Amino acid sequence: SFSGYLKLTDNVYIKNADIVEEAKKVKPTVVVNAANVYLKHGGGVAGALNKATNNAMQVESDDYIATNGPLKVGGSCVLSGHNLAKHCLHVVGPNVNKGEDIQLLKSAYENFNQHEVLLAPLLSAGIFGADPIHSLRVCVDTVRTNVYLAVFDKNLYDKLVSSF
């Protein structure tokens, strides 16, 4: 199970970790991907998770999009976790750099409530452009299931913990 996490609340835990390394170590039931509506895993967490699967996540995702069309911002889909987890929950947080409504971040986090335990990044953080402090606040106030947050940057991790 999950080790080295700081407990923030009854159900939210946080660690300064590379989510790829964390997933390979833990092999959790669910790893969350910071997806976009097209499931194009080019960069950020998605690019890193996809690279760890040797592009198998992207091949599976392209078939999913060809069949179902794009996801909604705030929506999700469950696909294979490949070599990282049993399942990958691809969740689309709003991308502030695309002018998407930050209010959709709560809807994005609500997808986590369909899974008892998840390894996840902060939604809409990083290249999605939202304030990670705000993302953590929405996470804590929305997710009721057990979420283990992996924050790649030590400096950001320290800021998130110290300001919680």
Cα angle vertex 74, ends 72, 79, to 5°? Answer: 70
For 14, phi then psi, to 5°, come to -140, 145
Domain boundaries, the chain: 1-164
Number of CB atoms found within 10 A of residue 59's CB? 12
How do strand 6-7 and strand 76-80 relate by DSSP bridges? unpaired
User: 89 with 118: CB under 8 angstroms?
Assistant: yes
The experimental method is: X-ray
Nearest to 53 by CA among 73, 23, 77, 28: 23
Record the resolution, in angstroms: 1.1
Q: Which amino acid is at 147?
A: V
